[PDB]
DNA sequence: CATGCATG
DNA sequence: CATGCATG
């Protein structure tokens, strides 16, 4: 029902998202910042073999594109549940220390979770899949996140960079959080009887009745889907009395 | 007033302490543990004079003593929150690795400190100065903590070691606590109507009335003096309404 | 692999 | 100075 009625709301049924109302982001640098190119430490063909499918997908999705940049940061093969299942992790620390910092306005629901009265006991918890990737990166700021990739029997060979906000970038959480707040501001005003808490990509909708959480939830999915975002159907806690939000269990 | 009546209770009035009822401690090693001597790190001689005043003090107190041992750990010049001067900080990690570990036995969980009945609001907070140094090291375990220190004036040039529980040794906190529990047990039984909390070298005495706290505090100080322990009068919170204990501030 | 931050 | 833990 939830999936079938809102295919564009889930990653499982609508594919990767793209925030339709968010203009490409330009990344301001610190005044004295100049390009830094960190050589890629040779990777075992194994680690490279595991990472190939992920790069290939990103490349197929257009999230990654070839490029030539005076900037370059190392790609690290991270090990997690899965033998030859290496995960591509970029070390953007040298880029991060050269990028201008931003100062949020985030009430921080993590603490503002206390701003959820017992008056609202019906919940719906959603987490957006690949949130950061929904925000586009302006072509002028794309060269900043380049890394090297060489694969003979694949096609390309040299540098690739991101066309979307990257994981590992210090301002991604804050930039995504601001964008989502701007996009859901209307939803809030239109649903004054609902309580919506949002922390980066983690959403919690609370209402005073079962019917309200139901209709409110249907309305949230519609909005997210129309906006281009994608919720994870597998981790979704739809219309529950007891839920897990930000590591905190709610009764 | 609390000094002249209990000169042996305070460090400022009774000098360094020595736990009279605590036999010299033997330090169990791990089965395969063999001697490890990590050459003295490379450190400026301009700091070789800043530590002398501290090494000279300990040697005069009998806390440090000459010795030749197959064991050896580096000594590194580190600053301290107190007076602006460089003190000796031994890196015992390699020794800590080869030493048998020990497991606690006293109720520490926060649900214990807060377990303090609001009925006892007249407190007394004390912290024992150089607590670890109150416990002696059996000579068969002294060679384990040896470190080098060369200087003509000192008389000879070779190795020094401790004859007291050393700082930076993994088990000192636990060993001292156990020792103090055994030494104060008698006191706890003699004053059942008093609440005595102790965490390493941090004590809290709480009674129901102001007079009982005054009697209980006098009694505690006299007991610690007889036992050889020394309280820091500089930071002693003698029989107050508002006191800070282990961080928290309670009334 | 490389580093930042804490700790002996 | 060294190094153990976390993290990009
Ligand atoms: Hg996306
Ligand atoms: Hg580029
Ligand atoms: Hg002492
Ligand atoms: Hg010795």
Coordinates of C-alpha atoms in Angstrom, one line a residue, chain B residues 5 35 46 58 74-75 123 129 142 151 157 163 177 180-181 213:
Chain B
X5 CA 43.4 18.8 65.6
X35 CA 61.5 -8.3 30.3
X46 CA 67.1 21.7 28.6
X58 CA 61.3 11.5 45.0
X74 CA 60.9 5.8 28.6
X75 CA 60.4 8.9 30.7
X123 CA 28.6 16.4 53.3
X129 CA 47.1 13.5 47.7
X142 CA 60.3 -2.9 41.7
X151 CA 73.6 13.0 35.5
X157 CA 74.5 7.3 36.4
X163 CA 59.2 1.5 45.7
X177 CA 40.7 1.5 45.8
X180 CA 41.2 1.8 50.9
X181 CA 38.1 -0.2 51.1
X213 CA 28.8 15.3 60.2

